[model samples]
Target: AIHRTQLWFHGRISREESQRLIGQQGLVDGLFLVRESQRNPQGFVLSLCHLQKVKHYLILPSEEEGRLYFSMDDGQTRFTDLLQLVEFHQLNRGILPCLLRHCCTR
Candidate 1:
């Protein structure tokens, strides 16, 4: 119950800033992060909101050659790191289930 927020992009924008960016039209524009799960905390999830619902890619990291690999689902997908996953979904829109209209890094 300690972690309360889901959308956590980066320190680039504060909570108030991110909230302000979410207009009434259902478009959330800003750098955002998501953690829709509590069972795992070391890794992360990223998201987008549309039509009163949210969509995201699960960031579950595995190890390889002393590095962290990431997966959007459980073990069905793989990427070198968090950055790789984000970059891939940013342009490809695989299972994220939304149109990425804006991008921000934090």
Candidate 2:
């Protein structure tokens, strides 16, 4: 069985990037993390398969207006981007323990 989940993250992005993302499907769908800044701005994407592992984590610099995103992958591609992979790690940190406990209890 497959489960579908959608989560929203708030961060800074250029009006252009935001518009571009809203217009697209795949880019926004798999995004794991986003960092917004008036200066030195960036965004990160993640693949859900990599995130399923509890040990994996995504790390982002402690900056203001940083947003994180997560989604399950429908395809068989590994996330090659370092930033996206790190975001997966960050979210997975807390999620892994909860998942483990739930599974064990079941």
Candidate 3:
């Protein structure tokens, strides 16, 4: 098993706020992921926590581009979500089938 890091954003924040966070730092550095309430896209801030450590790789799928990407994060690193990982990978690797699947299922 390998160590991993992830960042979580409060769901209560507005879309603009989310975009700003992601745009400013989230997108530039860490992997950014947003969890929206099914009831409303702009409902309430959920929780903002960093995934201290994980044993699985991150997989992201791009519906628009139909591509996959694979990646790994250092335990000390930070990211918003899997989306940010995908986006970053895409920028470097170009659009493809993005999939960040870890060897460990859990």
Top model number, lDDT: 1
Estimate, for each residue in 2-97, the C-alpha lDDT of model 1 and write its tens digit: 223212344233334433444333455333454433445566656566554544445777876787667866657788755566566657767756
The lDDT of each candidate is 0.52, 0.32, 0.33
Lowest lDDT 10-residue stretch of candidate 1: 1-10
Q: 1 or 2, which is superior by lDDT? A: 1
| Model 2, position 32: C-alpha lDDT score | 33
Preferred candidate (TM-score higher): 1 or 3: 1
Write out the backbone clash pairs for model 1. Answer: 8-33, 9-32, 9-33
Q: How accurate is candidate 2 locally (lDDT)?
A: 0.32
Q: Compute each candidate's TM-score over C-alphas.
A: 0.57, 0.22, 0.27
Worst 10 residues of 2 by lDDT: 97-106
Best candidate according to TM-score: 1
Model 3, runs deviating above 4 Å:
1-6, 38-106
